[PDB]
Amino acid sequence: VRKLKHHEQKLLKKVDFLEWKQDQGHRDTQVMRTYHIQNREDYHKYNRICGDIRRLANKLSLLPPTDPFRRKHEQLLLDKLYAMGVLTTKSKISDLENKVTVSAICRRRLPVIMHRLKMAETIQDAVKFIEQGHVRVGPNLINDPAYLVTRNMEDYVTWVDNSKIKKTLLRYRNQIDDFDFS
Amino acid sequence: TRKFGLVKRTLNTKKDQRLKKNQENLTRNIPQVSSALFFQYNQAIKPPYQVLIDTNFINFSIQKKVDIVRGMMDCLLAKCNPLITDCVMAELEKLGPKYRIALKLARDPRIKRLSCSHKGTYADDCLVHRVLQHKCYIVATNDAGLKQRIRKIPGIPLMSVGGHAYVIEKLPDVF
Amino acid sequence: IKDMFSSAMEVARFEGAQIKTVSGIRGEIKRALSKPEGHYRAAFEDKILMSDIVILRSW
Amino acid sequence: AKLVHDVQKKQHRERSQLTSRSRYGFLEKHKDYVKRAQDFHRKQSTLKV
Amino acid sequence: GLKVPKAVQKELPFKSQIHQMKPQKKKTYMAKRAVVLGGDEKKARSFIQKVLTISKAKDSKRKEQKASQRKERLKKLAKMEEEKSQRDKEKKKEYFAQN
Amino acid sequence: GGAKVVIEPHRHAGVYIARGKEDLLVTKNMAPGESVYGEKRISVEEPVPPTKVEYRVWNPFRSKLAAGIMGGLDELFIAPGKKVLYLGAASGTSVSHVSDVVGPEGVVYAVEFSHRPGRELISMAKKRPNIIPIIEDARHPQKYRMLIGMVDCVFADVAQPDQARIIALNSHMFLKDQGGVVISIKANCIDSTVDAETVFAREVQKLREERIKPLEQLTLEPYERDHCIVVGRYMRSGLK
Amino acid sequence: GPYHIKYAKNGTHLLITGRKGHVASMDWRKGQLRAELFLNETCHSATYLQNEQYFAVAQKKYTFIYDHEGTELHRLKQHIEARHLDFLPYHYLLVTAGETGWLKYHDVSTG
Amino acid sequence: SRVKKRKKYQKAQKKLKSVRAVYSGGQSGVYEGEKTGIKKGLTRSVKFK
Amino acid sequence: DDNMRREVQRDLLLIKHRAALDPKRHYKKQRWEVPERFAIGTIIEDKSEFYSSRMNRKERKSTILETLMGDEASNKYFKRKYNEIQEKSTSGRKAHYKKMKEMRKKR
Amino acid sequence: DDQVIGKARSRTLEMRLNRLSRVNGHQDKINKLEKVPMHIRRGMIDKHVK
């Protein structure tokens, strides 16, 4: 912590007060900084599900390469994860080990969907807006940031009517019709 | 009256300078080509020449039975001063007790000797550095890599054991 | 295109022929116009200009 | 020029607009047309974007 | 210039909107107020403008001439590298054919 | 001749560049209002009213150190608070420029052996108080070891064949560890039987034999034929 | 909640933990607090490590390790349910026991 | 054959002013200045090892 | 200060664009942005040598710009070079386009 | 194959791919060892040789 001299750094090399090997390079912290994750245990709650997908993918690739059970369940899991939005392509089954990843499950969260739909300028702005209760999917208002938005369910991410944000974008283009409140 | 999007403060491996990989928190230098040189001529060197030897040149001299100073003299037809750097001498001593003949032929009062000031005994690095610094040196060598380095840097004549006598290449006044 | 032919019979004789401007814009003559006699309608690779000359290379 | 004569790689000179057709100035040739066409194509490309 | 149509440019995204400012038709007060100096100052202005456009056109001439230099150096350099790579891929086959 | 320039600080601290249509290497003037060897001066009015302070043009054809500066040396050790031991202060030509680069808070010990140059050195060191003129032979540093203590850079403009021994003796007496050693080597005055690169290589080898690690050499060719400046530092332990 | 108290081994710093979430490391004899962090899960105990500069807190399940100003340095994936932490200062060992029937010694220096 | 080597040596020693800096003969008249510029960032000196 | 930079702001432009003041001078390629600390100074040629570098009392000026404006050969070169740059820059833009259209229209 | 269940299948396929790729692939690139520390790889080797 004091920038050890040469004899000290030679004499105690494995000493590190910040980065440990159980930390795994602080990647929970790293991807929760990237996608602005509030609570500490969401990374590991997603890591359990990525481990489920990859455990099944291992145990399913250990079946013989031609039997219809392996082919049906590999294709069925691939279709389910593409439809949910974690996987970005349902083509190859090496996605079920390589491209299945806590960052993919985190890119499917509601503020990241928002920021990619240009509905907020950054992920922290999207977090603030859906905490303030501006965003509804479908009819019903969504209030928490961790909400996972599937591919067919991202067509209905809008703002609530009577939103001040909806009002100011309509009045920026002065398409505001005050009959329907905005 | 709290703040929105509240997070738990963790450390930033991209930013925190307390950890080691983030401890990394103009004047150009174009060295002029030497005033000893014409385009590729080296118009300034003149006899008495001085020639930097290395270890495989000495080994090939003894394997071909050429004397060092007399082979240099009847190669260049000029008076030569041969120079063993301390790293070439270190390399000959490190070659072991098989090369005792070569070591005590390099120990010769007619062969003068320089004093290199660096760590390690890499004679190719030392010869290349002290020849591209100064351009007043002939390099006598038989290493293929050192021969390619020396004949790529300009204005430096290169001597080598070929056949039963020494040959010289980048010296344009040999006859 | 105005005057390389004197009659719609002549253009009818030469229909479908490939022409080109002096800019190398390739083209094809398509149909003789009705009322101005040697005038016809051609289609080109893109928009030719009013300062061009079309060319029917014959032998 | 390995086996070419200098009287063979001469300079062919380019022709002018006909004097009867002179109010439409400057009969344009293939370099002028490509300067026209690639300008039109880059502007249509950014319009399509 | 590129004349993007109004029907397209009214329906553009917020990042892609085209900042086109209208000309001024009214003799505004700051423009009718603001003083310009004359005589030696207007010939100083003329001189500085002439010097700056001569400097800019000289720089444009120099960089265009360097572009014409380095495209033909690229051409001869690529020819010499192609000849070199041909020599390498035949010397490698010689080496392996002997060994 | 009556024109106007803009003064601008150089990379090297204590020296400046005056940009006009020909730009000049320039130093501040320690004794304002007179020229020492007929160089031209620049008088700025810096802002009690503003005061007229002035500057002196450093002539590279009459100064090996200015030829080195404007050929481009990566590090001079002559700096604005330092102590320089000038060896071979042949007149007050370059010693005045070294003196006012070094400034009022630093000291230049100007060692010269001849006596009419010494008389001109003393009359120049009157109006430049930061010059200690020492009229003595530099080949015997013990004869003036009492007058000088612990210099920071030695500059050597001696033109004698026992140059490296003079530089080594004066450095071992008065230079401090990791201090500067700036040498102006003249090939023809060392010896003319060998070429210039041979004598520069031998002098650099002599310096590292007397444990002065060379950092840099510069030929300073458009101003002097067959000259050199070798800039080294006095390592005193471990050139390796 | 009820505050588990802890002092540094020289009496300069105080480390309190609320049962609810409130962990505060402070210089109790000046008026200087240097970490006040509200970790909204039920914390149980804390201790300093070799200094006021690092402290370990035993949270809902996992033991966490925080620096001087309160940024989280480590989440220990072992030490599954600690209720008792104690540092061994000459050996640099954080010792951990709790609702599991396991006792875990963790080297703080190497990690 | 003689005038060709007279005029390819004049070309060569005009190119030599580009690569090195050639000693032209010293100070001609009054020291006018550097006449071409002074770069305070470039150091054209050979560093050791 | 900016109050003095607004007085020496023109000859700093002249020193920045040195390279196109004389057609025979041809400086070495630097950029020379305006330095943060500078000082404008006047050369004292002393009272030792006369007539060679001596700019007399009757032609000493107060900027570099007044000297360049008083030079009459530089005024010839700047006016000539500016007119040829001008007629190169207006070569085929709009007066040419509308005189081509009027050429079409006249007949 | 079409009847070989897990760990036999993974190591069998890996052995076949190694044996096919050892002809044209480089010898410093085909058989990469798993990175094991020095003082435990040497103990692994000593116990295996025992």
Ligand SMILES: [Zn+2]
């Ligand atoms: Zn060596």
